[PDB]
Amino acid sequence: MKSVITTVVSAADAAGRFPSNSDLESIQGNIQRSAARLEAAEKLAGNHEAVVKEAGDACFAKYAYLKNPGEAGENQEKINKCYRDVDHYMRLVNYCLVVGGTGPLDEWGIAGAREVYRTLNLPTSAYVASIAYTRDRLCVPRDMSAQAGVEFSAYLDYLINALS
Amino acid sequence: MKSVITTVVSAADAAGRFPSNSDLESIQGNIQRSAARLEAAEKLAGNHEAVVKEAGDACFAKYAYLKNPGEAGENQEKINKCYRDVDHYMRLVNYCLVVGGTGPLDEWGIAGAREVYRTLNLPTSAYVASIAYTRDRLCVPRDMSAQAGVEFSAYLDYLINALS
Amino acid sequence: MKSVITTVVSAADAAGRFPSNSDLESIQGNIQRSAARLEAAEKLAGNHEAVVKEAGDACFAKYAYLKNPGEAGENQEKINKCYRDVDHYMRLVNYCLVVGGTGPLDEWGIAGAREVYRTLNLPTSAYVASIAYTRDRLCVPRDMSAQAGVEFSAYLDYLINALS
Amino acid sequence: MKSVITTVVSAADAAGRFPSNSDLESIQGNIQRSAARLEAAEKLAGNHEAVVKEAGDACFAKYAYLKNPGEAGENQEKINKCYRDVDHYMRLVNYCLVVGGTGPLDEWGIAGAREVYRTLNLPTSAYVASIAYTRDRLCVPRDMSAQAGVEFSAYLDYLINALS
Amino acid sequence: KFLGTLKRSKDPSGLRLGFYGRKADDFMARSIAMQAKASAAGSGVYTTQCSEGASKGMAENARTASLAKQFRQAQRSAREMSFDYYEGRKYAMKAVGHICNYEEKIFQQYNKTAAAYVMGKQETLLSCDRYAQPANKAEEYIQKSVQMQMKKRSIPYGVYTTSCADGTVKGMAENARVAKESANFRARQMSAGAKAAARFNARRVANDWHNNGCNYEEKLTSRFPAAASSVRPTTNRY
Amino acid sequence: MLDAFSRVVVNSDAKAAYVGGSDLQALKSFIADGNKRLDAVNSIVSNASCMVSDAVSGMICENPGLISPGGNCYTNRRMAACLRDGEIILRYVSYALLAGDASVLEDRCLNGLKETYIALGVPTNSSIRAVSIMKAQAVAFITNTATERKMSFAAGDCTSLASEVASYFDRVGAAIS
Amino acid sequence: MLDAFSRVVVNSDAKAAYVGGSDLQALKSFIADGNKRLDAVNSIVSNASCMVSDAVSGMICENPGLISPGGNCYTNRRMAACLRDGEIILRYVSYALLAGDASVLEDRCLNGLKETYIALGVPTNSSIRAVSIMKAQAVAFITNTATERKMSFAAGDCTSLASEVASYFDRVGAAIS
Numbered sequence A, B, C, D: 001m002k003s004v005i006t007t008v009v010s011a012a013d014a015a016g017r018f019p020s021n022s023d024l025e026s027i028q029g030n031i032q033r034s035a036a037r038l039e040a041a042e043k044l045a046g047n048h049e050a051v052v053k054e055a056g057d058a059c060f061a062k063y064a065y066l067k068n069p070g071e072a073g074e075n076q077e078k079i080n081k082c083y084r085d086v087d088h089y090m091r092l093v094n095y096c097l098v099v100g101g102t103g104p105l106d107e108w109g110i111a112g113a114r115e116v117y118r119t120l121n122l123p124t125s126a127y128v129a130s131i132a133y134t135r136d137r138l139c140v141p142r143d144m145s146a147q148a149g150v151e152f153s154a155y156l157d158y159l160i161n162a163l164s
Numbered sequence E: 001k002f003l004g005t006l007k008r009s010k011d012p013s014g015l016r017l018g019f020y021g022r023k024a025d026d027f028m029a030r031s032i033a034m035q036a037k038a039s040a041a042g043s044g045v046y047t048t049q050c051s052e053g054a055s056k057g058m059a060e061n062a063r064t065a066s067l068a069k070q071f072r073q074a075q076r077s078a079r080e081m082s083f084d085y086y087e088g089r090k091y092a093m094k095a096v097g098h099i100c101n102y103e104e105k106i107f108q109q110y111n112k113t114a115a116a117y118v119m120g121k122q123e124t125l126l127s128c129d130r131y132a133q134p135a136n137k138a139e140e141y142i143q144k145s146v147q148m149q150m151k152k153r154s155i156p157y158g159v160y161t162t163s164c165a166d167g168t169v170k171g172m173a174e175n176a177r178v179a180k181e182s183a184n185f186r187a188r189q190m191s192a193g194a195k196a197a198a199r200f201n202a203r204r205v206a207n208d209w210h211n212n213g214c215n216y217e218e219k220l221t222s223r224f225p226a227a228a229s230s231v232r233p234t235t236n237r238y
Numbered sequence F, G: 001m002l003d004a005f006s007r008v009v010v011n012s013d014a015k016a017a018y019v020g021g022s023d024l025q026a027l028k029s030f031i032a033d034g035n036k037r038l039d040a041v042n043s044i045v046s047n048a049s050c051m052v053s054d055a056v057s058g059m060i061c062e063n064p065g066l067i068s069p070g071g072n073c074y075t076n077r078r079m080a081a082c083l084r085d086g087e088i089i090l091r092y093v094s095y096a097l098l099a100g101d102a103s104v105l106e107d108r109c110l111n112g113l114k115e116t117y118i119a120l121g122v123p124t125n126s127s128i129r130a131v132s133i134m135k136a137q138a139v140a141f142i143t144n145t146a147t148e149r150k151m152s153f154a155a156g157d158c159t160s161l162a163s164e165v166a167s168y169f170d171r172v173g174a175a176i177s
């Protein structure tokens, strides 16, 4: 769990020091952020399913070979398991979008990405090509402005960064 | 050095993680406190010497025994060494008052306070009684308001906290 | 516990060696000092209370500021707590005076002298000025001679040494 | 090097403590044993060679098989190397006899006794049977009394103890 | 050869290999240590694993005590210095188990890289004495026996040798004691996730590094892993 | 870890009162025979190697059930382990002897020990047999009451010194039980 | 780590010959003033806190260039570090004093030390100034030749004892140089 407070009070913890005016100033940036960094949660609280179904077939468009035999996404039930897999991804992006860190990602999104796509033959290239196609859908029209829309990008991008 | 950035980028350092949207929100609180937390520097940039000379003789008033033989502040040159010693203290308070931490205190003010008053027989009680008398001189009249005057208190008080 | 035997048998212990004619010669010096080093116990087994009440007001004489407000020894009950505090000190001196070490001091007198006078604002200068005034009361008249009177000094002095 | 001072000042060293009245009493027993514990040096400063040549042939008497082929002490040059080997032994006994320890033994006599008689096939039984025959030659007639003669025994005996 | 530049008596340490390689070695050892410190804090938190201090003094006194211990490594005899280089090669090859033909020829060209690697690997693989938690009363006893056995390296024949000098003021003596059981309490403090894996980490470390055989005594290690964790048989002279 | 001088001083902290001039006279009775104790414990380290060599040979001769397979001293490594477990008793009781005080036992060896011996399946009766050998080794060695060992000391009493060491192996046989 | 008794015994191993009855008479001359040495070194630990308090105050008063920024004792942590680097000298030379033998210096402190001081940029002249303070502190303290400190001992000579300690700080000023 990777919030700013999880950093700074564990810093004074492993210091053993007093919680002095070292750690106090850390929270108010996240507090000031509460006007910006968590306002990108409601835009996909309106679009839960309506972004992963248009990203996943785009991934299947650039990777049409997935539906062959000898692949992962061969038939439609593996297509549903694709459509929930990316759902879990930007789900956790919307999770870390309200914490002050990537704690839900760093415990549940990208930690342990080593063999789950290696042994199961899932292309992490296909995952990042699906979720990077979600990234250019950020614009000041029909979202809120770049005061708040950019933290979505700032949280999906680390998912790219440790997936790819 | 104990600024909020020294916490959060060393957090991602000892993480080894990417500088994701965990550490980004930390700075803007210090940035918004550039309207408040460092505006208490100019009030003793007007009163450099004019507060320690009225605090130190107040310490000598509540502790008149200091000027005896067999003490520390016996004669006037030890009184000058008193008047520079507290000068160093609220000097470092005005230092940490512009950093986002108590880094100058935690390296230079209160770290290593163990034997410098133990072997040299200096009463740390007299030090905190001198500098607590500086604390009630904060008021919205003739300072700026408690948006900015309180961070002075918030930085001298940790000096009390590790001195006493 | 810091007797000579606590040194030498723990030496052969952490050696794992046999208790050879290394450790044998250690005890007989303490045995010969049973004629000298513990004969300074009865002189304050006659003067239990009769030395701390004349040392403590002498400390209050050189430090008359103690009875002010804002101090430790403000009123008479803190004066009684002073008079038992130094009682504990030369009590433990008379304790280590019969052990062959400063074991009662090194566990109970001066170990942990770090914050008990720092946070409680007690001047350790006042403690050593009280107990050094007890030191020049050693003389061959009305004590026994310097065969035995000097071990009192040799045990209060380490109390000075780690208190001051 | 295993003197009493090598114990007690290294004790305060690995303590990091002050050289207090813990370590002071250690030396005066060795100082009082300068009347006793090193007076057994001159009795074989008169008998250097005159004890090892009568111990070694006694070892050869109880072990006459040594002079056979297939042994260590087969011919006379190995007999000379026997006669210097035990010379080194009670030489080092006379060395540790003046130090306050078995430092010359514990570095040079019995430390490293593991393979020097194992690989070289030397019977350590024959060594201790040679040097135990030197032990009953201690008597108050024609030595000094058991105030001083016993420390010889007290230093050859540890040579038995780690050789055998 | 009168008045030759070379001197018969002085003090080489061995391993010198030129001046420029000394700035190389400590820096390789530094980033190996950073790689080790990126594991137990290795997600973003600073766990009670590292635990620099406990109070006012216990922060900055653990500084100068560690700097003291680093100095005590510097002022050793050429005998033990050479011996430390010699054991460091043979132990650093017993680190990953594989003869990595590049990363073996690092650690036999280099030693404080090797020493730092062995230490930092023993810290993330929590197989250490300061992470042991013996539940059995039989386990604490044998843990004690191994601890007593270790002193035989420090104390060869009866004297303490400045290898457990542990801080050199009146105060520096007492602070090491409280800093001991501050961390020794934190051995039973962290989580059920960790410190159940320590019992398996000493099962990864002591069974194969130091004791290749002794199956009747290797079954003691698999019986009592807390005693097998506190065996500490790398010769740090401590 | 603690000695006979400070044995009374933890009791004197237990009252929080001053030590007398009378309570430390027991230290004088302890203190006159100090040179007796040093005439004794050198004989405790006289033939301590022969003492333990005597001990496990004299323990194994009435019970060679340990030399049976599965018996605890069949294997020579188990035999040397038995020697190692035995020699520290000769260490620890004489640390207490020169202490005049039984403090080195309970903090260095006694705790967690019979728990290991039942964890290792060590027969405790063999160990109490070996330590009871030692209890009569020691009182014979402090006197000249040995068969060939004549450690001639300054003449007189060591029954105070014999009762001291006899007050030490009892706790050894107790704590391993 | 090594003492005055065994100082001659490494030399006696250096010949591989027996110690005499004559060569150990220097130990008797060392040994008669042993109680003198203990009447001395208690005064070395008499006001050792005041000694070092005197030492760095009396070193900083002729050279307050260390109180300048960048000067080695400007920072109070550097000042306490100076106290720490100073107090171990008072430890180590008196370890050698009670040794009667300069062995604790070269194995515990002297080696690798000026290399650290030039590695840390420590001014060596300030340290030789502080240790030369100590060399005259010690001979004043073993006598009653102090201003207010009257450590009255059994009367007579300690110039043997003064030449002993004066034969100790010289190696301290030498090895840090």
Ligand SMILES: C=CC1=C(C)[C@@H](Cc2[nH]c(/C=C3N=C(/C=C4\NC(=O)[C@H](C)[C@H]4CC)C(C)=C\3CCC(=O)O)c(CCC(=O)O)c2C)NC1=O
Binding pocket: A056, A059, A072, A073, A078, A079, A081, A082, A083, A084, A085, A088, A089, A108, A109, A120, A121, A122, A123, A124, A126, A127, A130
């Ligand atoms: C909490 C967070 C969380 C996640 C991040 C995901 C991660 C995840 N994905 C799968 C499992 C899967 N994930 C996919 C998805 C895909 N395969 C591909 O080749 C494409 C790249 C992509 C579709 C576009 C598929 C097809 C499976 C089933 C294949 C398999 O694992 O056997 C499984 C195991 C379940 C199973 O085997 O079916 C898990 C844990 N699930 C979670 O619960």
Ligand SMILES: C=CC1=C(C)[C@@H](Cc2[nH]c(/C=C3N=C(/C=C4\NC(=O)[C@H](C)[C@H]4CC)C(C)=C\3CCC(=O)O)c(CCC(=O)O)c2C)NC1=O
Binding pocket: B056, B059, B072, B073, B078, B079, B081, B082, B083, B084, B085, B088, B089, B108, B109, B120, B121, B122, B123, B124, B126, B127, B130, G057, G074, G075, G076, G079
């Ligand atoms: C960078 C930060 C910084 C500080 C915090 C101070 C801390 C500090 N104070 C003193 C030194 C001193 N400080 C005092 C002050 C006092 N003594 C008392 O008993 C009263 C409580 C108080 C006066 C009211 C005195 C009298 C001395 C000189 C006494 C001495 O240290 O010998 C010294 C050593 C210099 C000297 O010995 O003179 C240092 C480093 N100085 C610094 O450079």
Ligand SMILES: C=CC1=C(C)[C@@H](Cc2[nH]c(/C=C3N=C(/C=C4\NC(=O)[C@H](C)[C@H]4CC)C(C)=C\3CCC(=O)O)c(CCC(=O)O)c2C)NC1=O
Binding pocket: C056, C059, C072, C073, C078, C079, C081, C082, C083, C084, C085, C088, C089, C108, C109, C120, C121, C122, C123, C124, C126, C127, C130
């Ligand atoms: C076993 C050993 C042992 C000791 C060494 C002492 C140490 C000691 N002193 C005090 C406590 C005290 N000690 C003093 C004494 C003095 N204060 C001063 O400023 C003067 C220097 C001096 C009188 C001359 C006073 C006034 C208190 C009470 C103040 C306080 O601690 O709140 C306390 C806590 C009890 C309390 O808070 O009242 C303890 C443990 N007591 C012991 O049991």
Ligand SMILES: C=CC1=C(C)[C@@H](Cc2[nH]c(/C=C3N=C(/C=C4\NC(=O)[C@H](C)[C@H]4CC)C(C)=C\3CCC(=O)O)c(CCC(=O)O)c2C)NC1=O
Binding pocket: D056, D059, D072, D073, D078, D079, D081, D082, D083, D084, D085, D088, D089, D108, D109, D120, D121, D122, D123, D124, D126, D127, D130
């Ligand atoms: C500084 C301390 C010191 C010592 C303790 C001795 C120890 C010692 N002994 C021998 C060497 C020897 N020591 C002996 C002696 C004996 N062999 C026996 O079987 C009998 C028990 C005994 C004669 C009674 C013999 C015969 C050799 C030569 C055999 C050999 O080592 O090859 C050697 C090697 C030299 C050589 O090989 O010749 C050394 C170091 N020497 C020392 O310098």
Ligand SMILES: C=CC1=C(C)[C@@H](Cc2[nH]c(/C=C3N=C(/C=C4\NC(=O)[C@H](C)[C@H]4CC)C(C)=C\3CCC(=O)O)c(CCC(=O)O)c2C)NC1=O
Binding pocket: E032, E035, E096, E098, E099, E100, E101, E103, E106
């Ligand atoms: C500058 C060079 C240099 C190094 C690489 C490292 C050494 C090193 N290797 C690994 C990590 C590893 N090290 C190996 C070892 C090897 N891999 C093989 O296939 C070879 C057979 C063998 C020698 C290269 C393996 C297989 C891993 C991954 C699994 C593991 O963590 O052990 C780790 C843990 C960090 C990680 O998991 O990546 C470290 C510190 N130190 C250094 O100073």
Ligand SMILES: C=CC1=C(C)[C@@H](Cc2[nH]c(/C=C3N=C(/C=C4\NC(=O)[C@H](C)[C@H]4CC)C(C)=C\3CCC(=O)O)c(CCC(=O)O)c2C)NC1=O
Binding pocket: E036, E037, E038, E039, E040, E041, E049, E050, E051, E052, E053, E062, E066, E119, E120, E122, E123, E124, E127, E128, E129, E130, E183, E232, E234, E236, E238
């Ligand atoms: C994530 C990586 C990581 C580490 C490896 C440790 C490294 C480490 N160890 C210690 C401090 C210590 N570390 C050890 C551990 C050992 N000493 C040895 O000789 C063995 C090799 C080893 C285990 C038996 C011990 C015994 C101490 C205390 C004394 C000392 O410093 O040596 C300290 C000082 C702070 C403290 O722990 O109290 C640090 C940072 N910390 C970390 O965060």
Ligand SMILES: C=CC1=C(C)[C@@H](Cc2[nH]c(/C=C3N=C(/C=C4\NC(=O)[C@H](C)[C@H]4CC)C(C)=C\3CCC(=O)O)c(CCC(=O)O)c2C)NC1=O
Binding pocket: E141, E142, E144, E145, E146, E148, E216, E217, F056, F072, F073, F077, F078, F079, F081, F082, F083, F084, F085, F086, F088, F109, F113, F116, F120, F122, F123, F124, F126, F127, F130
């Ligand atoms: C570290 C300090 C220390 C002790 C407190 C004692 C206690 C003790 N004994 C053993 C372990 C043992 N101790 C014995 C000894 C005996 N079993 C018997 O039945 C006889 C009564 C007796 C011999 C006369 C045996 C046989 C083992 C097990 C060795 C084995 O079976 O391989 C161990 C495990 C490893 C070790 O030897 O250290 C310990 C801690 N021994 C020690 O070394």
Ligand SMILES: C=CC1=C(C)[C@@H](Cc2[nH]c(/C=C3N=C(/C=C4\NC(=O)[C@H](C)[C@H]4CC)C(C)=C\3CCC(=O)O)c(CCC(=O)O)c2C)NC1=O
Binding pocket: E142, E146, E149, E210, E211, E212, E213, E214, E215, E217, E218, E220, E221, E227, E228, E231, E233
């Ligand atoms: C609590 C866990 C625990 C262990 C697993 C063992 C492991 C062990 N045994 C020995 C002790 C020994 N170790 C060996 C080595 C071996 N003996 C053999 O039968 C094999 C050939 C090889 C197996 C590794 C030998 C021969 C000794 C006895 C001599 C010696 O001390 O080196 C040592 C060196 C310290 C010592 O005991 O002196 C260690 C660490 N001991 C323990 O206390």
Ligand SMILES: C=CC1=C(C)[C@@H](Cc2[nH]c(/C=C3N=C(/C=C4\NC(=O)[C@H](C)[C@H]4CC)C(C)=C\3CCC(=O)O)c(CCC(=O)O)c2C)NC1=O
Binding pocket: F047, F050, F051, F052, F053, F054, F055, F056, F057, F058, F059, F060, F061, F062, F132, F133, F134, F135, F136, F137, F138, F140, F141, F145, F146, F147, F148, F149
């Ligand atoms: C069951 C098989 C069995 C044995 C192996 C022997 C061993 C043995 N010896 C003694 C008895 C003793 N053992 C010693 C010890 C020694 N005596 C010496 O002459 C040496 C210096 C030293 C090592 C041998 C002493 C001094 C006594 C008492 C009197 C005596 O016999 O000397 C005892 C009784 C314990 C006691 O009284 O102290 C036993 C069991 N006897 C047996 O019944």
Ligand SMILES: C=CC1=C(C)[C@@H](Cc2[nH]c(/C=C3N=C(/C=C4\NC(=O)[C@H](C)[C@H]4CC)C(C)=C\3CCC(=O)O)c(CCC(=O)O)c2C)NC1=O
Binding pocket: C024, C025, C026, C028, F032, F033, F034, F035, F036, F037, F038, F039, F040, F042, F142, F143, F144, F151, F152, F153, F154, F155, F156, F157, F158, F159, F161
């Ligand atoms: C550090 C080394 C060291 C020693 C080796 C001894 C040496 C020694 N032993 C005794 C003296 C003695 N030792 C004994 C002991 C015994 N007598 C016997 O007949 C039994 C064999 C044995 C029982 C254990 C007795 C009885 C005395 C005489 C003391 C007395 O009778 O009061 C004395 C006389 C001083 C005195 O006791 O007051 C001395 C110097 N002392 C030491 O300081």
Ligand SMILES: C=CC1=C(C)[C@@H](Cc2[nH]c(/C=C3N=C(/C=C4\NC(=O)[C@H](C)[C@H]4CC)C(C)=C\3CCC(=O)O)c(CCC(=O)O)c2C)NC1=O
Binding pocket: G047, G049, G050, G051, G053, G054, G057, G058, G059, G060, G061, G062, G133, G134, G136, G137, G140, G141, G145, G146, G147, G148, G149
């Ligand atoms: C530059 C500023 C300056 C000072 C701060 C004082 C400090 C001071 N005192 C002494 C000189 C001394 N200082 C001591 C030390 C002490 N004497 C005592 O009575 C106490 C027990 C103990 C702590 C104060 C002793 C014993 C002497 C020599 C004789 C004496 O004056 O007592 C010296 C000379 C060094 C020496 O001779 O040893 C100096 C510089 N003098 C100065 O010129």
Ligand SMILES: C=CC1=C(C)[C@@H](Cc2[nH]c(/C=C3N=C(/C=C4\NC(=O)[C@H](C)[C@H]4CC)C(C)=C\3CCC(=O)O)c(CCC(=O)O)c2C)NC1=O
Binding pocket: E064, E067, E068, E069, E071, E168, G056, G072, G073, G077, G078, G079, G081, G082, G083, G084, G085, G086, G088, G109, G113, G116, G120, G122, G123, G124, G126, G127, G130
């Ligand atoms: C471990 C045993 C030990 C030593 C052998 C000495 C030597 C020594 N000095 C320093 C380190 C130092 N020593 C000094 C002391 C001085 N510099 C000066 O210019 C003056 C001459 C003198 C004070 C009077 C200073 C100022 C530092 C560096 C501290 C710093 O700058 O932060 C260090 C590094 C860390 C440490 O303090 O341990 C060591 C090992 N000090 C020790 O603690």
Ligand SMILES: C=CC1=C(C)[C@@H](Cc2[nH]c(/C=C3N=C(/C=C4\NC(=O)[C@H](C)[C@H]4CC)C(C)=C\3CCC(=O)O)c(CCC(=O)O)c2C)NC1=O
Binding pocket: D024, D025, D028, G032, G033, G034, G035, G036, G037, G038, G039, G040, G042, G142, G143, G144, G151, G152, G153, G154, G155, G156, G157, G158, G159, G161
């Ligand atoms: C373990 C604790 C312990 C002590 C504290 C001393 C206590 C002590 N000091 C001296 C005795 C003495 N001490 C001194 C020393 C001095 N005299 C002076 O006038 C100077 C002030 C000072 C110089 C340093 C002298 C000169 C003697 C007399 C010895 C003689 O003259 O031969 C004696 C007499 C015995 C003797 O010296 O032979 C004793 C018991 N001894 C100890 O065993």
Ligand SMILES: CCC1=C(C)[C@@H](CC2=N/C(=C\c3[nH]c(C[C@@H]4NC(=O)C(C)=C4CC)c(C)c3CCC(=O)O)C(CCC(=O)O)=C2C)NC1=O
Binding pocket: A011, A014, A015, A017, B001, B010, B014, B106, E037, E041, E046, E050, E051, E052, E059, E060, E061, E062, E063, E064, E066, E067
């Ligand atoms: C070389 C002898 C030596 C040390 C070691 C350190 C020890 C140390 N760390 C500290 C304090 C501290 N501790 C941590 C966390 C800590 N840092 C990490 O890299 C990891 C993995 C950690 C878990 C324990 C941080 C981030 C700081 C503040 C910055 C720092 O001082 O390192 C503090 C002082 C308290 C403070 O700074 O406020 C000290 C003394 N200092 C020394 O002089």
